[PDB]
Design an enzyme around this catalytic site. Structure first.
Site, PDB file in Angstrom:
ATOM      1  N   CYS A   1       0.866  -1.233   0.126  1.00 45.32           N
ATOM      2  CA  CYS A   1       0.037   0.033  -0.158  1.00 45.32           C
ATOM      3  C   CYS A   1       0.777   1.311  -0.045  1.00 45.32           C
ATOM      4  CB  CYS A   1      -0.903  -0.060   1.223  1.00 45.32           C
ATOM      5  SG  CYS A   1      -1.675  -1.521   1.577  1.00 45.32           S
ATOM      6  N   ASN A  78      -1.373  -2.050   5.452  1.00 47.11           N
ATOM      7  CA  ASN A  78      -0.861  -2.997   6.005  1.00 47.11           C
ATOM      8  C   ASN A  78       0.331  -2.872   6.943  1.00 47.11           C
ATOM      9  OD1 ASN A  78      -1.088  -5.860   6.649  1.00 47.11           O
ATOM     10  ND2 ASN A  78       0.206  -6.455   4.846  1.00 47.11           N
TER      11      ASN A  78
HETATM   12  C1  LIG Z   1      -4.911  -6.849   3.041  1.00 51.15           C
HETATM   13  C2  LIG Z   1      -5.297  -5.329   2.661  1.00 51.15           C
HETATM   14  C3  LIG Z   1      -3.927  -4.603   2.028  1.00 51.15           C
HETATM   15  C4  LIG Z   1      -2.648  -5.180   2.743  1.00 51.15           C
HETATM   16  C5  LIG Z   1      -2.057  -6.570   2.228  1.00 51.15           C
HETATM   17  O1  LIG Z   1      -1.272  -6.644   1.050  1.00 51.15           O
HETATM   18  O2  LIG Z   1      -1.951  -7.377   2.909  1.00 51.15           O
HETATM   19  C6  LIG Z   1      -5.783  -4.835   3.900  1.00 51.15           C
HETATM   20  C7  LIG Z   1      -5.970  -3.189   3.932  1.00 51.15           C
HETATM   21  C8  LIG Z   1      -7.421  -2.822   4.525  1.00 51.15           C
HETATM   22  C9  LIG Z   1      -7.956  -4.006   5.106  1.00 51.15           C
HETATM   23  C10 LIG Z   1      -9.517  -4.321   5.258  1.00 51.15           C
HETATM   24  C11 LIG Z   1     -10.057  -3.013   6.118  1.00 51.15           C
HETATM   25  O3  LIG Z   1      -9.104  -2.837   7.450  1.00 51.15           O
HETATM   26  C12 LIG Z   1     -11.427  -3.451   6.594  1.00 51.15           C
HETATM   27  C13 LIG Z   1     -11.738  -4.700   7.380  1.00 51.15           C
HETATM   28  C14 LIG Z   1     -11.440  -4.744   8.842  1.00 51.15           C
HETATM   29  C15 LIG Z   1     -11.655  -6.007   9.308  1.00 51.15           C
HETATM   30  O4  LIG Z   1     -11.154  -6.200  10.555  1.00 51.15           O
HETATM   31  C16 LIG Z   1     -10.747  -7.125   8.512  1.00 51.15           C
HETATM   32  C17 LIG Z   1     -11.483  -7.306   7.148  1.00 51.15           C
HETATM   33  C18 LIG Z   1     -11.174  -5.940   6.345  1.00 51.15           C
HETATM   34  C19 LIG Z   1     -12.091  -6.129   5.047  1.00 51.15           C
HETATM   35  C20 LIG Z   1      -9.769  -5.735   5.861  1.00 51.15           C
HETATM   36  C21 LIG Z   1      -8.848  -6.785   4.915  1.00 51.15           C
HETATM   37  C22 LIG Z   1      -7.716  -6.384   4.795  1.00 51.15           C
HETATM   38  O5  LIG Z   1      -6.823  -6.554   5.895  1.00 51.15           O
HETATM   39  C23 LIG Z   1      -7.336  -5.026   4.093  1.00 51.15           C
HETATM   40  C24 LIG Z   1      -8.281  -5.020   2.662  1.00 51.15           C
END
Ligand SMILES: C[C@H](CCC(=O)O)[C@H]1CC[C@H]2[C@@H]3[C@H](O)C[C@@H]4C[C@H](O)CC[C@]4(C)[C@H]3C[C@H](O)[C@]12C
Ligand SMILES: C[C@H](CCC(=O)NCC(=O)O)[C@H]1CC[C@H]2[C@@H]3[C@H](O)C[C@@H]4C[C@H](O)CC[C@]4(C)[C@H]3C[C@H](O)[C@]12C
Ligand SMILES: C[C@H](CCC(=O)NCC(=O)O)[C@H]1CC[C@H]2[C@@H]3[C@H](O)C[C@@H]4C[C@H](O)CC[C@]4(C)[C@H]3C[C@H](O)[C@]12C
Lengths: 323, 327
Positions: A1, A78
């Site tokens: 990110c 992240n």
């Molecule tokens: C995985 C991603 C980016 C980081 C990476 O490459 O791992 C991260 C950034 C924002 C996150 C999301 C958001 O924080 C919104 C949600 C929060 C919940 O606690 C988990 C699911 C949830 C839907 C998350 C899923 C995932 O961890 C996301 C999409």
């Protein structure tokens, strides 16, 4: 990110979402009177209306990033391993889950000063949204039209940093990311003088020699450096459109294309979407990996009502065919 | 400048044009029977039809890059100081100017093998188009669906190189660009193993560590390496549309934004436009610095037209606005 801010004719804030798959993310508008419920705090029935990007699960807006009606932005990025959420509740703190953190701040605060004051009283608690959506490690960029702060909650506590450059990526922690910039002081936008030695005739056969040393890979540190160099030196636009155009070019410098970053599972990490919020005009602009054309949606000052309003992302390349 | 090829569901060819101003670029279609005039050779009245990007001056199509009706492409990239055009005419060779070179090749040649044979025997002459539009040193990538070659006409002569990677930028000469890749053999798309030393426990706290060492600046050598790494490792697309989308992502890795590269004049070098020719389907797709939406124009067979057909570039951000603001 990679999340950035930009100050021009208007004031901007936005991010790349880099991941190996799409969550089915969409535009989500939370109206003023949508009731925000918290696992360990009293519900907020009337609040500032939000517009942002994320998913809706169990009628709850799980924002990746969002702004409110006052032009205060917040984006979760992240932060694997370093993010620590506490198992213990605290009587003298607001006990808030990481998924409630964007609604908690953006629902109640109009600017960064009010955000900082509220983050100072917080205890991020280790409770997942559901069994299907468990907690992941995050850190946050909070930005208004003037400035921004970084929030990183680790084993050592809740850390808030003034962000002097309006840049954030992933690991390491923010003081390491800022210190990492120091060794690149010699980089330049112009052809530098031969300081190597005056006793050898070093020739310049092309433009852009000043930048030599700038890292090109898609590791979080290299992207922090490249985004900072690209953003801080980017030319000023004459209009808001030119600013938005320039904003997407800056995010394009640290975009991840499919193929160059294969994860441990064997999946290809790529920039799922890129967005830019005009904070003064309360307008979300975005692009996806599949569609280059910018889509815009304004959060309009209407007492919207009660329910979440969604606009799905269309993941098809919209080509202007002249025949 | 960066010119690349790509082999996917169809076969592609395209470039970034990097410059500190715009010429007022446009799509130019040259039909089969547009009479190509030459300063020092006989006119060609019937030839292959072209589609490409450039400007029209004195009713002449000055192509930056183009393809023909057979899917053979050719792009001229900046090659300052190394290009040598001859001041003497040859009695036994075709004396062709650099601005006539794209029409000369793409008008007559169906593939790279035919282009090579014609390029081998050319005499590129030092004649400017006009006082307003003087010559600047160029080198060329010529590509079909199968392969591509690099043409660099220097003081030592006409050099044609097989291009094993389908990449080209600016200086240095092509053998130096290809040699420069050798030091980057260690780069990877995956998290590498700790070969530094197993006596220290080195940690990985994020993805993309394999790429560390890839240069990120916009110098021609750094763009050559970064474009090669991005192109060669880019994921296969399911459809032709996904290939085109992926093609613009590859060119985006070596895009120049306004502000990071200040030229000698004090003006900012930037990617004026990016394009992608579908060679099998003879279709030009392009974007500009000012507009992110891809614009497409197809070359249609029209064996009887004798006038240039032009579509000027939109230099305005076309946004898909879902709702109106209240200002
Ligand atoms: C995985 C991603 C980016 C980081 C990476 O490459 O791992 C991260 C950034 C924002 C996150 C999301 C958001 O924080 C919104 C949600 C929060 C919940 O606690 C988990 C699911 C949830 C839907 C998350 C899923 C995932 O961890 C996301 C999409
Ligand atoms: C070649 C065209 C004229 C014919 C024409 O308009 N052809 C394109 C078309 O018909 O669409 C002219 C018009 C404006 C000129 C430009 C402007 O004067 C600005 C600028 C001035 C400089 O002295 C030389 C470079 C150039 C980009 C100029 C190059 C060139 O001298 C241009 C671009
Ligand atoms: C982007 C570069 C800029 C080259 C330059 O002038 N460099 C000087 C330098 O680096 O010192 C090239 C690529 C294609 C070129 C054009 C095409 O070959 C078509 C046409 C060819 C004519 O001989 C001169 C004018 C021009 C418009 C060319 C102007 C300019 O030559 C262009 C657009």
């Amino acid at each position: 990110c990679t999340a950035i801010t930009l100050n021009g004719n208007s004031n901007y804030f936005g991010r790349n979402l880099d991941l190996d798959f799409s969550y089915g993310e969409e535009v989500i508008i939370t109206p003023a009177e949508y009731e925000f419920k918290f696992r360990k705090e009293k519900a907020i029935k009337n609040h500032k209306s939000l517009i942002g990007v994320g998913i809706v699960a169990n009628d709850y807006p799980l924002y990746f990033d969002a702004i409110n009606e006052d032009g205060l932005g917040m984006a979760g990025l992240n932060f694997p391993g370093n993010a620590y959420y506490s198992d213990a509740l605290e009587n003298d703190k607001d006990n808030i889950t990481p998924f409630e953190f964007i609604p908690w701040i953006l629902g109640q605060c109009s600017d960064v000063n009010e955000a900082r004051n509220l983050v100072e009283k917080i205890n991020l608690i280790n409770l997942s949204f559901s069994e299907q959506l468990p907690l992941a490690g995050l850190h946050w960029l909070i930005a208004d039209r003037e400035k921004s702060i970084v929030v990183e909650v680790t084993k050592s506590g809740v850390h808030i940093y003034d962000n002097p450059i309006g840049i954030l990526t992933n690991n390491p922690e923010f003081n390491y990311q800022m210190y990492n910039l120091n060794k690149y002081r010699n980089l330049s936008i112009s052809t530098p003088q031969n300081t190597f030695s005056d006793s050898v005739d070093l020739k310049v056969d092309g433009t852009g020699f000043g930048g030599i040393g700038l890292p090109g890979d898609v590791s979080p540190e290299s992207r922090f450096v490249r985004a900072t160099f690209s953003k801080l030196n980017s030319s000023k636009g004459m209009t808001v459109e030119e600013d938005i155009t320039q904003f997407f070019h800056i995010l394009g410098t640290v975009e991840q294309i499919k193929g160059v970053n294969k994860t441990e599972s064997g999946k290809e990490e790529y920039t799922v979407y890129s967005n830019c919020y005009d904070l003064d005009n309360k307008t979300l602009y975005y692009t996806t990996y599949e569609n280059r054309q910018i889509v815009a949606v304004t959060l309009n000052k209407d007492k919207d009502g009660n329910r979440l309003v969604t606009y799905p992302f269309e993941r098809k390349q919209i080509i202007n065919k002249l025949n």
